[PDB]
Nucleic acid binder design. Structure first.
Lengths: 134, 120, 51, 61, 175, 38
RNA sequence: UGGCCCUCGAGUGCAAAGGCAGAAGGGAGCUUGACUGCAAGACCCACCCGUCGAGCAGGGACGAAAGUCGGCCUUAGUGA
RNA sequence: UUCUGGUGUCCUAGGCGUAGAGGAACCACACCAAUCCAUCCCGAACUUGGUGGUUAAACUCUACUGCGGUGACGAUACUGUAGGGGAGGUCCUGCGGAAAAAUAGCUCGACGCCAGG
């Protein structure tokens, strides 16, 4: 859900620039949930979706949170935006660009995988679709 | 290291050329168990101006039961390289021990070269 | 403690060419006294510039 | 509260690029440590600066 | 004088044994070194003098008071505080005092497993050392009243695990 | 310095010689060495 | 305390970056150049400041000699 | 005129591993003693003086692609300009430049210089 070591406390923002290579073909699993829309994904989404496909699969097959957040986003109180002292202890975020794999799931029959990864796509802020291990 | 007396002598020379920095007319030695070689060489054109060795004196005199280097054969090799550039027009010459500590017989090669008017 | 301290030559106030005290301040004395042969005094060479 | 903001602003470029005209004494490089070593006709300085000795051209190699 | 026969009698047996092409490869006892690890030689100055006197008299030449590689906190160990005393002895005195080990350290120990070959013969090339039995009959033994480490290490030109052990067996060191 | 002159007085004659024909000086005098283990 | 891989991962008084393993790393020998009079030209450049400097004279250190040495691996340690 | 080590300079950098070949000369070790010297302990190094036995080690020479180094074209990313799409995050065409990565590959360097047998 978060990294153990705080290398640098705060870390300023970045920006998305669409994938062209490292399309993250498939490595584990057999069914992935390929992102299409660049955006951030917090660690709490990740929690949500994971719960979704774990309790939905619920019989077999292994989940794979293919990406780990590793960058902090800060938030400031309501004090007229003076100096950004402390907000990194707030949520973490994984920058996810297009063409990227978010989950992977094996050991599950076809359509059960479709319901797991479809629901999981409902819990998550960007339009995805599920891919088979070609 | 494993070529203790090769890494050692060789690199020690590279030391003598890193900081000691002899560049213009430089005479270098090389003392092996059978012989002494010596060169007067120029860096600009990278050719040995005037060499000499224990393969020109031993044409007349040497001894083998000794170490090919002995204070006296060195005396004669500095003798010869001296009386070679004593006539060639090389007054000052940047001496460099070839990594051999200056004590000993390379002394005798130096003083031998000095007595015969090499501005040293 | 790094107190400053100045050095001085061998005075010999004379009627010669401008001869004169030659101080040279230096630092660091946290020890017993240190003289040094800083040189090029009024007279050319020098030795044992004390204090 | 900020704690931060104490930058120096110092400047240290290459002064005479390869194939410019070097005066004598002119500075070739002002550097922090020795990126470029002295070759020949240049002199290192106290702080590793690299300055030309004779007029001509600078060749980085 | 262990050297001579060692040179003419027990060289041909290894030369024939390994089936060389050159005696020039046969191993020899290259060098040894004896050292005396000390708890605090700093605070026992006459213990530094105990290193000098004893370890000098025992072996051929003087010792070497050894300086701290790097410090260790808690203990009075600055980089240089002498904790360790060695004598890098070599040449042929080597032969005389591995001789007086064969002769006054094989006989006068009390426990005897001897020398475990696979013990203390482990290397890319031999470093065979022994711990304890520092005291000898020649030195007046009843002056020390404390324990004190020691090393007796060795080298070799051959890099097997036994030919220097066998070299100790061809000499007065079996078990 | 600490010279030792390791040549003159050497004591080391074992019970079963031949194996110990030799003997060497030093700063030790008793010419007898114990058989020990074997 | 002895033997094998090694990328300069060790250190360099103190922070970091750049540097440095013929070392700027460590240890020895002698020594005070952490001298006087200076200085072409550069770099920076609102000014005030600041930085480097081939080379010369005197008088020295070290070094057999070549040569190096007018402070400290460089940038903070300071104020008209 | 090859060979032998003597020094060096452009550099793809040059090596480690397996293999071999080298003693008439050269090179280097084993050997030997000690004034100069030297080992903070030791002739280990360094030194001077001797014997002058092997090529074993080291060096040199010829192969190797098992490693190491190197490294493409093409394509694509990206980007200059001229424009456009999208509520935005950001995306796309026209003319110009153009890779890193990987893979194929490419090397076990090229020249001088002096004393030689």
């Amino acid at each position: 859900l978060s990294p153990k070591r705080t290398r640098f406390r705060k870390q300023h923002r970045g920006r998305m620039k669409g994938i062209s290579y490292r399309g993250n073909r498939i490595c584990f699993g057999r069914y992935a949930l390929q992102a299409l829309e660049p955006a951030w994904i917090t660690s709490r989404q990740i929690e949500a979706g994971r719960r979704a496909m774990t309790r939905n699969a619920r019989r077999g097959g292994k989940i794979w949170v293919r990406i780990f957040p590793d960058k902090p986003v800060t938030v400031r109180p309501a004090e007229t935006r003076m100096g950004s002292g402390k907000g990194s202890p707030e949520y973490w975020v994984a920058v996810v660009k297009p063409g990227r794999i978010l989950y992977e799931i094996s050991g599950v029959a076809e359509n059960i995988a479709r319901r797991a990864v479809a629901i999981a796509a409902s819990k998550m802020p960007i339009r995805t679709q599920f891919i088979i291990s070609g | 290291h494993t070529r203790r007396e090769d890494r050692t002598a060789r690199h020690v020379r590279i030391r003598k050329k890193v900081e000691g920095t002899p560049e213009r007319p430089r005479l270098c030695v090389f003392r092996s168990n059978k012989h002494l070689y010596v060169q007067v060489i120029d860096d600009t054109k990278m050719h040995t101006l005037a060499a000499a060795s224990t393969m020109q004196k031993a044409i007349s005199e040497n001894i083998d039961y000794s170490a090919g280097p002995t204070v006296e054969v060195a005396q004669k090799i500095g003798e010869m390289i001296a009386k070679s550039c004593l006539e060639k027009g090389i007054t000052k010459v940047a001496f460099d021990r070839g990594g051999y500590p200056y004590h000993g017989r390379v002394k005798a090669l130096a003083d031998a070269a000095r007595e015969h008017g090499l501005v040293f | 403690v790094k107190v400053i301290l100045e050095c001085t030559g061998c005075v010999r106030k004379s009627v010669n060419k401008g001869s004169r005290g030659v101080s040279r301040y230096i630092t660091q004395k946290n020890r017993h006294n240190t003289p040094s042969r800083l040189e090029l005094r009024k007279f050319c060479p020098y030795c044992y510039k004390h204090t | 509260t900020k704690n931060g903001r104490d930058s120096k602003g110092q400047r240290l470029g290459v002064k005479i690029y390869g194939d410019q005209v070097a005066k004598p004494g002119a500075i070739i490089i002002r550097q922090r440590g020795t990126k470029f070593h002295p070759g020949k006709n240049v002199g290192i300085g106290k702080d590793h600066t690299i300055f030309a000795l004779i007029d001509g051209l600078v060749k980085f190699e | 004088r262990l050297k001579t026969n060692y040179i003419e009698k027990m060289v041909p047996l290894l030369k024939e044994e390994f089936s060389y092409s050159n005696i020039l490869e046969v191993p020899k006892v290259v060098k040894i070194v004896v050292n005396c690890g000390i708890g605090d030689a700093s605070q026992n100055a006459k213990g530094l003098d105990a290193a000098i006197n004893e370890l000098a008299l025992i072996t051929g030449q003087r010792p070497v008071k050894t300086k701290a590689k790097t410090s260790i906190a808690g203990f009075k160990v600055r980089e240089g505080m002498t904790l360790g005393i060695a004598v890098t002895l070599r040449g042929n005195l080597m032969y005389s005092f591995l001789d007086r080990l064969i002769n006054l350290a094989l006989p006068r120990t009390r426990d005897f497993q001897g020398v475990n070959p696979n013990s203390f013969d482990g290397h890319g090339n031999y470093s065979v050392g022994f711990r304890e039995q520092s005291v000898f009959p020649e030195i007046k033994p009843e002056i020390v009243g404390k324990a004190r480490g020691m090393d007796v290490c060795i080298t070799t030109t051959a890099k097997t695990d036994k030919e220097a052990y066998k070299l100790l067996s061809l000499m007065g060191m079996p078990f | 310095k600490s010279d030792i002159h390791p040549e003159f007085r050497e004591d080391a004659k074992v019970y079963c010689n031949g194996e110990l024909v030799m003997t060497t000086g030093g700063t030790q005098k008793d010419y007898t060495v114990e058989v020990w283990s074997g």
